[PDB]
From a paper:
The results indicate that the CE and CI spliceosome assembly pathways converge already at the pre-B stage. The molecular triggers and roles of B-specific proteins in these rearrangements are also identified.
To that end, we determined cryo-EM structures of complexes formed after the addition of an excess of 5′ss oligo to affinity-purified CE pre-B dimers in the absence or presence of ATP or ATPγS. ATPγS was previously shown to support the formation of human B complexes but prevents their subsequent transformation into activated B (Bact) complexes and/or their dissociation. Owing to the absence of the B-specific protein SNU23, which stabilizes the binding of a second 5′ss oligo in B-like complexes, only one 5′ss oligo is bound in pre-B5′ss in a manner similar to the 5′ss oligo 1 in B-like complexes. As a consequence, U4/U6 stem III, the formation of which is mutually exclusive of that of an extended U6/5′ss helix, is still present, as well as the U4 quasi-pseudo knot and its associated proteins RBM42 and SNRNP27K. In pre-B5′ss complexes, 5′ss oligo binding triggers the movement of the PRP8 RT/En domain (PRP8RT/En) towards the PRP8 N-terminal domain (PRP8NTD). These contacts help to tether BRR2 and PRP8RH to their docking sites in the pre-B complex.
Numbering used by the authors:
A (entry chain A): 224 to 501
B (entry chain A): 613 to 660
C (entry chain U): 114 to 555
D (entry chain C): 116 to 951
E (entry chain G): 241 to 255, 270 to 356
F (entry chain A): 1113 to 1335
Write the structure that this text describes.
RNA sequence: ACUCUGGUUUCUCUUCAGAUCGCAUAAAUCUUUCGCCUUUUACUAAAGAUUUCCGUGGAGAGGAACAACUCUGAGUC
């Protein structure tokens, strides 16, 4: 059946090592600040499109919100604009910076900053104070404002009481690999799961979902924006009513007496199909 | 191609990542094939 | 200078209904107090040293110190506080006296030409016609009786009903000053209570609005109390002993009809329908005009309404596959008869109204005796006169309504329209398609 | 489950506690862990946390908690029985912390949370300072302990040093805020609980000692916790806590015996399935099933930590040790919250927390029903027992004994005191327990006290609720069409009750202005208004900042206004307030109710003011907190001293009115030392018209402000923008564009991140966080809270060039165009008249 | 130009024929705001490695701020270990380049 | 007016009538005071005229206000929407570049005191487009010369009526070019079922004296 | 330490879809608007509602294959 796979941590470590080339180094969802599907949803639900986001055809004419007449408070003579109200402001807070927001989506506000250090040299121990980590004040603090216990007068502990986990290496060779896998992208975060088909594994998917391939010609931008538009339109309409009866028509055709089964090379099948099409 | 030729790789035609368009063509063919099957059945029948 | 008490009582600066004192001179109601609050600011700005209280309506005797009203200008206090007891209601029931208002207009108890909303004016007309009954004004003025029924906290229907009744009593009270009364508070209460149905935003059907208002009034007085029969409901309840028969479908042949009869399919079954308001449908419209090609008006005799004794009992028609035999038979006729013409009806494409004349004389009737001969002893006062008739006018899309009501006892029979306050003669009243009629058994 | 109601009767088994968090995710994770421990039916999904404290759908979708959730249950203890914990989880946002201010009066104990990796934050420091000023117990919780263990992968000794540094910083902040001797906080003292809130890993020193005792031996857990908590070192040869540190290569007791086992377990679990072998599990005394082993790394670690570390007994023990019962803790709360004094007989009875005494319940929280039509007033019952159907008089926040009309009588329906299951089965609730009174929502807006109708005739409501943050962002509200204007207004009222921080004001220009603290705050306000409180679509305006009017120079000439009655004229001169006095007065340091001698001594010592000036009648703005102070410097030689005493109330009312509505933009005015020069008035009471003084007083105030040099003032918001080191300089660039000034910048101790404290003007603060996050490509994060008023450049009334309708004005021209736009928008005359 | 760009931006805010491939007229990334136009690349403090970007080029294209800070903060032993690691990496790179174009 | 018809909810401007053709900054300043005055004047006019003899419906009327709030006036004229703006109120970089405005002066001041910017009315443009649709409709068997002469008459009439408004109104130019191409394509499909790749313009512009359609056009096609 | 505990691979068959059926994504028809427009094949581009289509899960059933090796909890153990 080859449907579910149960594997081990080192295999994920080595596969992630090999696939680092095709996988971005982003680990925190805050990088997809205004490029997550909800931001594009609320951009499409409005006329305004973010500079990194594709344009869209408005759902309705929306002539009511197109050019409203000047009102007593809507007059620009009273509104003060210190900074332009860019599309970022509208997408971030659709319910505040947008008159008549109507049917919109809600975007995630924030995720705690992933404070992770990627392993640089395997030989060096994992539980090591990396130089990038800021130093802390190792103050002597001869003062004793904190409470202090008795001096060699109490706390008689039995010798059979060990500090629990003992005779076990605190740092092992596999600690770095596992702790790196713990912050892997979606495919490698799972220790073991179910298979997916070959054709529905989009490798380039994580690429355009990034903010931008910085340092690119205009045509690259246009291609990225258009393909993001296609992806977001695919994401919008996604509901299966298909409560099928699991009638495997292909299996029934296989069971039909008019056809038989055999084994052959793929190239032979290809030439057979070419002859059949001719 | 942009990524394949990102650095030391030449700016020539040497790019080999067909899967990205292969999946799109597979999906479009999957969408199309109902029409071709229906028309081929219409021809194969007598009420063409 | 301005009497804005018709609008909802709310703060002009705090947007709060608690402790909302009104400016006696400026005319603005704010929730602040006389010292160090919104009302203090208003008094120190508008210079109005007097401001009526939120509940006691006590004008500020001092600019900020004390709030004690003066009985000299108690006209507004009496206008905002309907306190006509039953003994005073008898004086109110004596409408023959010239009850000139504070401004010198005509009080018109129950038939005051109060202002109506631009849209859904049919709802306002229906409310005025309901308020045109002196029993309705007497019930509204009985605040202690109204306050006797407990108001559940969950439902806001009781509060809206109480507000509407208070507004109606104020309109019918002689203490009122302006003939035109803003229905903005009443319209908002109706929209909120009726779940936006028959809202003032768009024109609403008179029959549907009247039915919704009657149901709301019944709910306000009815409920968990032992007095299940609501006073509003019991006033116009009625009872029809429709021996409904599930007659066989027309497609069923004679053999199938005989089989169904042997199976008691077409057996008459009593419906015991409430029939709060009678709904009499006009006959078919004239497709081709024969007498006068310009316009043919097939006036329906008033006996068509009285035909419900046997004509409705002979009805063998339904919109379903099976031709249901209604066999309607009104057993108990309520003292108040509310007849709905239901001229508007939806065709296969658009809803059209039959322009047939009402042709209903305003005199004694005998439909109750026709409906049940033995009930004549119970219904001694069968002579019911059409108290208030409301007729639609104009195209079905952009249309309006106009009503004429008669004071009970006095019999003024005047048009309730604000411009045409006094119109006693029918002036071809039955010629127009009367939307609804309301009569009292008397 | 009837024991939940049974324990409510015992007034000594209740632990009224409110939570705080750097971010709402951390606190709500802990609350969800507590709920899962108490309720076995609800289990958090592997994909996402349950987040039972996020009742609102807005918080669930946005990810940041919106409204405080007062939900908890009876929880057991290691050395004690189950106590009915009731915890009001608070949002973890700087602006939303204003809602947490309500919780300050809900309970008398704050179990503060601090992230291990993030460390101290601006929100955490502000909450700690506010709690210290609120006279409540503080028990710190090191949150996200797994971050140091897993995310940072720091060495165990380095992790212990970082935790000790965080604890020391918290202790220093507490000591700076409050001088009480109970400020000592440490695992030995029992004020620090290490609770990662992830994988259900929570403990204290006592919890670890109890685990050790359960595993083997019979060591006294209290002594072991007292010894192993600090850096006292352990000698194996002596086999005892040896403060002299005899062993050369030994690790501290906490590092050796507490942090090290957790690190070993985490390394075994995350490292490999063979690392967390069944042999290792047996050595740890746990036998997980094959199904639990087949799960992913995160669920396996969560299950292992939850099974190994008990059921959060250490947190319960720490709370019981320090957070007092309502009977013990009611007296300080009676002293602080109550404005009637604890010396009152009813106040004294409440201080004893007598269920059978008078009924005195203070409701400050407001919660909408599922249908949204009706509300429910949530509040603590200080004294008495509320019963369903029992009528009660709900005195509002503005209620006073002067007028009894400020309070109304209402009936209380079902109580629904229990909130963990959100059920309404509660019939009556004793004193000291939180009650969700139903049916009394209409008479009261927020922070109102209910009381028995006839039992007491002199009890008054508690002091009005106060907030640390100040609402400075104002936004206009209009309907799409006026046809259903009142409906929206209805929702507006539902907004005012629901959010205490939000302020709805009906401006004279016919505009409904909502005042809030932060941009996200007002966005949530509008979302709740449109989706729940008023389905009508609402049009808005561009956000505006409330402005202040200040003085820089003394008045050139005196300004006098004459009362109409026989020309009674008062003359005055306004001068700028002394530097540093504004924040001192605004911090409730000195109140007008203080004795004259005490105020004179304070002014002579601190600000060296003249004793005669101090002895003058002092106003100090509205509620004695307005920075604009008024001193009646009228010469005693004049015969108007008796008249001044007879007109002191009118003068004070005029001054407070002028403070509320100034001459420019009619906004609040601060740091104005209004000196009442003199007044000549006829002694006849008839000539002393009450309404002839306050308008004259405000006219004098306006003229004096015009006579003095006028300046505009904008609220500079403090922002603690945390960002990675590389972007730090780029972060300053953002402040360069938005007219921001960097106040300080320090690296995060023990974390690669870097905090920058900056002072961004409110005018450019709108969307500053969005600019910072987008420009840094989603790396930097910011959080802005209003810090202080700063004088805007330019002159409000100087004739300057009119700015373009859609172009930013030059810096010298900002004040005049701000003033003109504010005056026109408010509806008053735009042009400023010197004669007026 | 930037001031006029903001000016017309605020003004705009307030006041068959077969084709072979996409056209550049649909680009939306053109924003005059220099902060938005020039966004600081998220290098993750020396840990940002884009997928398609060449690893060696990315190391060269890296701002080296994190690398320089780590070198400054590295101790003498840490500096020695880093020097040994980079020497081994250079030897490996020489080994690979020997095979290429041999 | 408030005494006759109160406006407590400020719903007067809820259903106001304004010209959507003009840009946002100049069409109509729907200030509360201006709307109230417009409604009051309309009510006064409706009261001064009996509802029986005639009527003045608000749904099909137009009111313009000029004051310290609104600096413009709108006229519908004889099927031509023209807005007058005084020069003494706003400058807005005044210049003499386009011919779509009119310079109006005072007898004594002898200086340009106000400028009238005029455009074809929406009703007039719709009527012209309907006329073009009618001309293209009767093309089943009508002669090509008849169709092209009908177009010549229509375009000549519109231009002779409001050349200045045709030049000023961009929408008028767009619609006239669109319907001109419509008629050209009608002639082309009359010639042959397919569509010419080049469609040379010599046929459509050679005068009938020389043997051609001779279509007068307001467009700009480069031969 | 004692008794019962009892498979997983598979092949098909019949149902129900909750569950991002699927951490992927097409197409057809109809419907309203937008560019429309020169008739359908068609379009452009979005919304709305279906359908087919690639697939999948749950659940049940029937044979083959490891059915004898038990896994495992219960059985005071
Ligand atoms: O016709 P376009 O879509 O604009 O792109 C083509 C072409 O693409 P095709 O191969 O699809 O015809 C080349 O692309 P590759 O050969 O790289 O695939 C070529 O690119 P190179 O010069 O890199 O070979 C060049 O693009 P450019 O010259 O901009 O790099 C060129 O585009 P132009 O037609 O715009 O020159």
């Amino acid at each position: 059946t080859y449907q579910r796979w149960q594997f081990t941590l080192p295999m994920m470590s080595t596969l992630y090592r090999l696939a680092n080339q095709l996988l971005t180094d982003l680990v925190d969802d805050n990088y997809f600040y205004l490029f997550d599907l909800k931001a594009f949803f609320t951009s499409k639900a409005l006329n305004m499109a973010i500079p990194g986001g594709p344009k869209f055809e408005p759902l309705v004419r929306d002539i009511n919100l197109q050019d409203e007449d000047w009102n007593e408070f809507n007059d620009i003579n009273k509104i003060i604009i210190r900074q332009p109200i860019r599309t970022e402001y509208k997408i971030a807070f659709p319910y505040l910076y947008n008159n008549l927001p109507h049917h919109v989506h809600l975007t995630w506000y924030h995720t705690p900053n992933v404070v992770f250090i990627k392993t640089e040299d395997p030989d060096l121990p994992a539980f090591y104070f990396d130089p990038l980590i800021n130093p802390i004040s190792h103050r002597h603090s001869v003062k004793s404002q904190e409470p202090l216990p008795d001096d060699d007068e109490e706390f008689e502990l039995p010798e059979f009481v060990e500090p629990f986990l003992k005779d076990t290496p605190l740092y092992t060779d596999n600690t770095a690999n596992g702790i790196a896998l713990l912050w892997a992208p979606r495919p490698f975060n799972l220790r073991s799961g179910r298979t997916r088909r070959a054709l529905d594994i989009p490798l380039v998917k994580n690429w355009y979902r990034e903010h931008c391939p910085a340092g690119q010609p205009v045509k690259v931008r246009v291609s990225y924006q258009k393909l993001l538009k296609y992806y977001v339109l695919n994401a919008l309409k996604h509901r299966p009513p298909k409560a099928q009866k699991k009638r495997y028509l292909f299996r029934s055709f296989k069971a039909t007496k008019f056809f038989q089964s055999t084994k052959l090379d793929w190239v032979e099948v290809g030439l057979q199909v070419c002859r059949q099409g001719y | 191609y942009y990524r394949f030729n990102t650095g030391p790789v030449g700016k020539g035609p040497g790019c080999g990542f067909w899967a990205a368009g292969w999946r799109v063509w597979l999906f479009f063919m999957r969408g199309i094939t109902p029409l071709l099957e229906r028309w081929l059945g219409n021809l194969l029948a007598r009420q063409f | 200078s301005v009497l804005d008490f018709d609008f909802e009582k709310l703060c002009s600066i705090s947007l709060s209904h608690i402790n909302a004192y009104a400016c006696l001179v400026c005319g603005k109601y704010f929730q602040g107090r006389g010292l160090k609050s919104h009302a203090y600011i208003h008094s120190v700005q508008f210079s109005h040293h007097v401001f009526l209280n939120l509940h006691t309506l006590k004008f500020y005797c001092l600019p900020d110190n004390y709030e004690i009203i003066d009985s000299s200008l108690e006209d507004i206090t009496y206008v905002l506080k309907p306190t006509f007891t039953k003994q005073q209601i008898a004086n109110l029931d004596k409408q023959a006296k010239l009850s000139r208002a504070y401004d010198g207009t005509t009080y018109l108890p129950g038939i005051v030409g109060l202002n109506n909303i631009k849209a859904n004016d049919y709802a306002n007309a229906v409310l005025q016609a309901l308020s045109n009954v002196p029993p309705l004004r007497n019930y509204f003025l009985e605040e202690d009786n109204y306050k006797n029924i407990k108001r559940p906290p969950g439902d806001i229907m009781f509060l809206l009903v109480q507000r509407f009744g208070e507004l109606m009593r104020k309109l019918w009270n002689p203490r009122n000053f302006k003939a035109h009364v803003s229905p903005h508070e009443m319209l908002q209460a109706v929209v909120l209570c009726s779940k936006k149905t028959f809202q003032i935003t768009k024109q609403g059907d008179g029959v549907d609005f009247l039915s919704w208002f009657l149901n709301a009034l019944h709910s306000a007085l009815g409920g968990t109390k032992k007095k299940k029969k609501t006073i509003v409901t019991d006033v116009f309840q009625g009872s029809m002993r429709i021996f409904t028969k599930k007659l066989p479908h027309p497609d069923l042949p004679a053999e199938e009809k005989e089989q169904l009869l042997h199976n008691d399919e077409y057996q008459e079954t009593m419906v015991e329908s409430t029939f709060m308001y009678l709904t009499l449908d006009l006959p078919t419209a004239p497709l081709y005009k024969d007498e006068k090609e310009q316009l043919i008006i097939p006036q329906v005799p008033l006996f068509n309404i009285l035909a419900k004794f046997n004509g409705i009992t002979e009805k063998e028609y339904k919109t379903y596959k099976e031709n249901f035999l209604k066999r309607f038979q009104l057993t108990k006729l309520p003292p108040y008869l509310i007849f709905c013409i239901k001229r508007f009806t939806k065709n296969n494409f658009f809803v059209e109204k039959n322009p047939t004349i009402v042709n209903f004389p305003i005199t004694n009737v005998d439909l109750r005796e026709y409906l049940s001969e033995e009930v004549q002893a119970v219904h001694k006062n069968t002579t019911y006169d059409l108290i208030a008739n409301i007729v639609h006018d104009g195209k079905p899309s952009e249309g309006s309504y106009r009503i004429h009501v008669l004071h009970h006892g006095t019999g003024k029979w005047y048009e309730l329209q604000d411009l045409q306050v006094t119109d006693i003669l029918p002036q071809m009243i039955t010629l127009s398609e009367a939307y609804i009629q309301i009569w009292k058994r008397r | 489950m009837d024991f939940l109601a049974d324990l409510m009767d015992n007034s000594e088994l209740i632990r009224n506690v409110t939570l705080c968090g750097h971010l709402h995710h951390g606190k709500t994770c802990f609350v969800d862990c507590l709920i899962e421990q108490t309720h076995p039916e609800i289990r958090k999904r592997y994909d996402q946390d349950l987040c039972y404290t996020d009742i609102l759908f807005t918080e669930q979708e946005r990810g940041v908690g919106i409204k405080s959730t007062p939900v908890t249950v009876v929880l057991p203890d290691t050395k004690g029985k189950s106590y009915l914990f009731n915890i009001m989880d608070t949002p973890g946002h700087v602006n939303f912390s204003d809602e947490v201010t309500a919780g300050l009066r809900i309970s008398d104990g704050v179990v503060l949370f601090i992230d291990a990796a993030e460390g101290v934050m601006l929100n955490t420091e502000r909450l700690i300072k506010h709690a210290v000023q609120e006279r409540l117990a503080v028990t710190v919780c090191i949150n996200k302990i797994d971050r140091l263990i897993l995310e940072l992968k720091l060495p165990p000794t380095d992790a212990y040093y970082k935790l000790r540094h965080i604890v020391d910083e918290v202790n220093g902040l507490i000591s700076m805020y409050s001088t009480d001797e109970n400020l000592i906080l440490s695992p030995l003292l029992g004020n620090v609980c290490f609770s990662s809130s992830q994988y259900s890993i929570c403990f204290t020193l006592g919890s670890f000692a109890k685990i050790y005792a359960d595993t083997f031996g019979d060591i006294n857990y209290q002594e072991f916790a007292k010894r192993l908590w600090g850096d006292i070192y352990f000698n194996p040869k002596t086999r005892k806590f040896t403060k002299k540190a005899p062993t050369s290569s030994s690790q501290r007791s906490f590092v050796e015996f507490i942090l090290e086992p957790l690190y070993k377990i985490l390394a075994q679990v995350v490292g490999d399935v063979d690392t967390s072998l069944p042999r290792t599990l047996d050595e740890l005394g746990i036998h997980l099933t094959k199904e639990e082993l087949k799960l992913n790394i995160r669920p396996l670690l969560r299950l292992v930590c939850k099974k190994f570390f008990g059921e959060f007994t250490g947190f319960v023990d720490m709370c019981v040790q320090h957070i007092p019962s309502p009977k013990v803790g009611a007296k300080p709360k009676i002293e602080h919250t109550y404005t009637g004094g604890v010396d009152s007989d009813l106040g004294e009875a409440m201080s004893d927390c007598d269920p059978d005494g008078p009924l005195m319940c203070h409701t400050t929280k407001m919660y909408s029903t599922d249908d949204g039509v009706q509300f429910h007033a949530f509040g603590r019952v200080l004294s008495g027992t509320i019963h369903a159907g029992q009528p009660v008089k709900v005195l509002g926040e503005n209620y006073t004994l002067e007028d009894e009309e400020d309070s109304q009588i209402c009936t209380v329906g079902r109580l629904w005191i229990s909130v963990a299951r959100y059920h309404i089965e509660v019939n009556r609730v004793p004193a000291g327990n939180w009650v969700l009174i139903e049916g009394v929502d209409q008479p009261i807006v927020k922070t109102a006290t209910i009381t028995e109708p006839r039992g007491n005739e002199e009890a008054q409501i508690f002091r009005p609720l106060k907030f640390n943050t100040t609402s400075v962002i104002k936004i206009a509200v209009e309907p799409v069409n006026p046809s259903e204007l009142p409906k929206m207004l209805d929702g507006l009222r539902k907004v005012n009750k629901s959010y205490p921080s939000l302020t709805t004001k009906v401006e004279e220009s016919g505009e409904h202005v909502i005042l809030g603290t932060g941009e996200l705050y007002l966005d949530c306000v509008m979302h709740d208004l449109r989706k729940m409180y008023s389905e009508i679509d609402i049009k808005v305006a561009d956000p505006v900042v409330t402005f202040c009017e200040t003085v820089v120079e003394t008045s050139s000439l005196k300004c006098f206004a004459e009362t109409p009655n026989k020309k009674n004229k008062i003359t005055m001169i306004a001068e700028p307030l002394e530097k540093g006095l504004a924040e001192d007065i605004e911090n409730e340091v000195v109140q007008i109710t203080w004795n004259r001698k005490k105020l004179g001594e304070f002014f002579q010592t601190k600000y060296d003011w003249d004793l005669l000036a101090a002895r003058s009648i002092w106003a100090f703005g509205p509620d004695a907190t307005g920075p604009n102070i008024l001193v009646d410097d009228t010469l005693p030689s004049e015969v108007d001293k008796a008249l001044l005493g007879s007109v002191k109330d009118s003068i004070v009312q005029g001054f407070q009115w002028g403070t509320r509505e100034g001459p420019l933009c009619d906004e609040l005015i601060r740091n104005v030392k209004f000196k009442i020069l003199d007044a000549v008035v006829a002694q006849e009471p008839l000539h002393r018209g009450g309404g002839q003084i306050i308008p004259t007083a405000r006219r004098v105030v306006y003229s004096a402000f015009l006579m003095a040099t006028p300046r505009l003032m904008e609220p500079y918001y403090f922002v603690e923008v945390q960002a990675p080191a590389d972007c730090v300089s780029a972060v300053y660039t953002v402040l360069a564009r938005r007219r921001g000034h960097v106040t300080q910048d320090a690296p995060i101790p023990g974390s690669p991140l870097y905090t920058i404290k900056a002072f961004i003007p409110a005018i450019d603060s709108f969307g500053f966080e969005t600019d910072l996050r987008t420009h840094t490509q989603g790396q930097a994060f910011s959080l802005s809270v209003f810090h202080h008023w700063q004088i805007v450049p330019g002159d409000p009334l100087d004739k300057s060039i009119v700015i373009r309708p859609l172009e930013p004005q030059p810096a010298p021209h900002l004040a005049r165009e701000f003033m003109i736009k504010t005056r026109r928008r408010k509806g008053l005359s735009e042009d400023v008249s010197i004669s007026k | 130009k930037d001031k006029s760009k903001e000016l017309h931006a605020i003004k705009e805010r307030y006041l068959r024929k077969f084709v072979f491939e996409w056209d550049a007229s649909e680009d939306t990334s053109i924003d005059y705001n220099p902060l938005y136009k020039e966004r600081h690349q998220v290098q993750l403090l020396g840990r940002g490695f884009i997928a398609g970007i060449d690893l060696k080029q990315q190391k060269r294209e890296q701002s080296r701020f994190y690398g320089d800070l780590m070198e400054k903060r590295r101790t003498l032993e840490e500096k020695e270990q880093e020097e040994a690691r980079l020497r081994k990496l250079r030897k490996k790179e020489a080994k690979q380049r020997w095979d290429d174009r041999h | 007016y408030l005494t006759e018809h109160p406006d407590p909810n400020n719903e007067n401007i809820v259903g106001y009538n304004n010209k959507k053709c003009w840009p946002r900054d100049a069409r109509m300043r729907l200030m509360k005071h201006d709307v109230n005055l417009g409604r009051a004047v309309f009510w006064d006019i409706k009261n001064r005229l009996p509802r029986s003899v005639t009527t003045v419906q608000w749904e099909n009327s137009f009111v313009s206000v000029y004051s310290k709030d609104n600096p413009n006036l709108l006229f519908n004229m004889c099927g031509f929407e023209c807005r007058i703006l005084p020069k003494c109120r706003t400058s807005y970089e005044e210049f003499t570049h386009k011919d779509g405005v009119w310079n109006l002066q005072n007898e004594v001041t002898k200086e340009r005191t106000a400028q009238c910017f005029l455009r074809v009315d929406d009703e007039s443009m719709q009527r012209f487009h309907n006329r073009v649709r009618q001309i293209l409709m009767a093309s089943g068997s009508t002669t090509f010369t008849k169709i092209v002469n009908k177009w010549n008459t229509a375009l000549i009439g519109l231009m002779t009526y409001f050349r200045e408004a045709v030049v000023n109104t961009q929408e008028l130019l767009d619609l006239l070019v669109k319907c001109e191409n419509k008629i050209q394509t009608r002639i082309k499909i009359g010639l042959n079922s397919k569509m010419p790749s080049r469609f040379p313009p010599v046929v459509f512009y050679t005068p009938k004296e020389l043997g051609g359609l001779g279509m007068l056009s307001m467009g700009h096609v480069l031969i």
